[PDB]
Amino acid sequence: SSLGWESLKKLLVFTASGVKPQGKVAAFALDGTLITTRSGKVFPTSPSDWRILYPEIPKKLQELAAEGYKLVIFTNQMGIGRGKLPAEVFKGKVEAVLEKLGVPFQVLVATHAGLNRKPVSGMWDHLQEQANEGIPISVEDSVFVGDAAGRLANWAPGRKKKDFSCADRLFALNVGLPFATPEEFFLKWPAARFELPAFDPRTISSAGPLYLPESSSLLSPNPEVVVAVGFPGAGKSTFIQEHLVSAGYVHVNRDTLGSWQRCVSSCQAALRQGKRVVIDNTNPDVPSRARYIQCAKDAGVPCRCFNFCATIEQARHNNRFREMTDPSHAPVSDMVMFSYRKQFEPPTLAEGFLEILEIPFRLQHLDPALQRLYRQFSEG
Ligand SMILES: [Mg+2]
């Protein structure tokens, strides 16, 4: 008599018989939190390779349900979106686990990257907005329990390995939920040491100057070559389009001209016509930039560098954000980010730049909802 499974593009939801909406929730991850492998291997050998993680678990769940907590699972299962784990098989595994736990659960399953993948709070919002009969949930009175908690190596005998991820802890931080690991919650073990990511998108801002030094000017009245430098996926092209190309700068993209000679001819022709040029590429190294500086030198026009300050993790954050929110965004691969960092050398005046502007990494004028999303951790 369970309502059963609902299937959405990037979400599965199961609602067991006996689930009731409530004003407070006790939520759990699945793998490594309520279950682990029966085989004793790190990864399951089959769909049936599971056992309840600790014998203490069903007693705690019975107590929570009697106290009026709605019991919920929030589980990341990317293998489904990637075609490695059949949805219909995973659904059966979940039902079997729930039968063994012996209490009514509502389960939410993030099958893909993006809005629903912890730590992004998409599943919470779905629970609250669509799957709780309109009853507001007190986050302060709720709890999330998971093993992707960013713990350091050796927090217990047999754990010479740090947690694979901090996604569970960060999900709870994004929602504002009190958080505990499975051992802290079910076994009353002392709290384990953990680390958060170095980049905290909650401290991102829209304030401050667009570029430094403020006494400089984005535009020049005369021909010149501007060389943009910075990680891909962190908003360079958008900036360049908004502030330079819109002002008549000729956009040069070496990647699409093919050869170097065609790129310089293009630059030279623009300058000969009295135009200004911007090179909108990553340009991470001295040799990469030297070609454009030499071109400018040969033409007798100034070369300036716009140096975008975005760090690798800011850029990767921005890229994930745009993947989730902008249907036209071209995803930047981790390979390309990695490659850029490996090749990067900071620009200096000795290369031959007239001046270097720094472009700080700042929040876009995004919709209120998108600004809330921008401030969420999106990778564990
Ligand atoms: Mg887990």
Swiss-Prot record:
Superkingdom:
Eukaryota
- What are the entry keywords? Acetylation, ATP-binding, DNA damage, DNA repair, Hydrolase, Kinase, Multifunctional enzyme, Nucleotide-binding, Nucleus, Phosphoprotein, Transferase
User: Could you state one GO biological process linked to this protein?
Assistant: protein K63-linked ubiquitination
Molecular functions (GO terms): ATP binding; ATP-dependent polydeoxyribonucleotide 5'-hydroxyl-kinase activity; polynucleotide 3'-phosphatase activity; ubiquitin-like ligase-substrate adaptor activity
User: Which reactions are catalysed by this chain?
Assistant: a 3'end (2'-deoxyribonucleotide 3'-phosphate)-DNA + H2O = a 3'-end 2'-deoxyribonucleotide-DNA + phosphate; a 5'-end dephospho-2'-deoxyribonucleoside-DNA + ATP = a 5'-end 5'-phospho-2'-deoxyribonucleoside-DNA + ADP + H(+)
Q: What is its EC number?
A: 3.1.3.32, 2.7.1.78
Q: An example Gene Ontology cellular component term from the record?
A: site of double-strand break
Stretches for region Kinase: 199-375
Give the UniProt subcellular location, in the record's own words.
Nucleus
Where ATP is bound, by residue? G230, F231, P232, G233, A234, G235, K236, S237
Region Phosphatase, annotated ranges? 4-195
Q: How does it assemble?
A: Monomer. Interacts (via FHA domain) with XRCC4; mainly interacts with XRCC4 phosphorylated by CK2 but is also able to interact at much lower level with unphosphorylated PNKP.
- Domain comment, in the record's words? The FHA domain binds threonine-phosphorylated peptides from XRCC1/4, and is responsible for the recruitment of PNKP to the sites of DNA repair. The affinity is ten times greater if peptides are also phosphorylated on the serine preceeding the phosphothreonine.
Q: Which family does it belong to?
A: In the N-terminal section; belongs to the DNA 3' phosphatase family.
Q: What does this protein do?
A: Plays a key role in the repair of DNA damage, functioning as part of both the non-homologous end-joining (NHEJ) and base excision repair (BER) pathways. Through its two catalytic activities, PNK ensures that DNA termini are compatible with extension and ligation by either removing 3'-phosphates from, or by phosphorylating 5'-hydroxyl groups on, the ribose sugar of the DNA backbone.
List the protein's name.
Answer: Bifunctional polynucleotide phosphatase/kinase
Primary gene name = Pnkp
